Amino acid sequence: KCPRCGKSVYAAEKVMGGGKPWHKTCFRCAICGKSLESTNVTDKDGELYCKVCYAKNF
Ligand SMILES: [Zn+2]
Ligand SMILES: [Zn+2]
Numbered sequence: 001k002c003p004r005c006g007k008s009v010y011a012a013e014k015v016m017g018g019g020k021p022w023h024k025t026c027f028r029c030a031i032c033g034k035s036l037e038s039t040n041v042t043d044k045d046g047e048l049y050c051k052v053c054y055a056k057n058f
Pocket of ligand 1: 002004005006007022023025026
């Protein structure tokens with residue numbers, strides 16, 4: 001499930017952040033509001049962050 005929306009996601013939009021399919025829209029980081037193209041995923045405490053914003057913040 002997409003823990004941001006609370007909505008179950010499956011193979012169609014299944015982009016696995018934290019071992020679970022998120023919405024590709026929410027396969028993002030909420031810092032910038034940027035959706036990530038399938039990859040570019042970095043998990044931090046259950047929250048998804050862009051590899052770009054990761055390099056900026058961390
Ligand atoms: Zn979502
Ligand atoms: Zn971001």
